[PDB]
Amino acid sequence: DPGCSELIQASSRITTCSTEGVNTKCRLSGTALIRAGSVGAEACLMLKGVKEDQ
Amino acid sequence: DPGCSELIQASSRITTCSTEGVNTKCRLSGTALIRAGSVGAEACLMLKGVKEDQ
Known part of the structure; x- marks a missing residue:
């Protein structure tokens, strides 16, 4: 049930x-x-490499 | 003076x-x-490689 919330x-x-x-x-x-x-809630921080799927 | 116009x-x-x-x-x-x-005008076509500078 818990998951990401703040997405930057x-x-x-x-x-x-x-x-x-x-x-x-x-x-x-x-x-x-x-x-x-x-x-x-969660403080998720995704990473973007050289493409979109990565 | 004229150059690229429809650039996709x-x-x-x-x-x-x-x-x-x-x-x-x-x-x-x-x-x-x-x-x-x-x-x-020109019909230029942008080509993106694997990164941003390419």
């Missing part, structure tokens, strides 16, 4: 990617601010 | 890509329809 997109400043032999291996380095959920 | 992106159904060492080339094999430009 991460910036590209703390998100980098590099493909080596058809293999999207992204790296994450930096700080990010997100709002916490209530009782039963 | 190609579909991923007839456009494939592959990475072979820092150089990610893309193939083009298919048929696509686009609106023809006016007198002087």
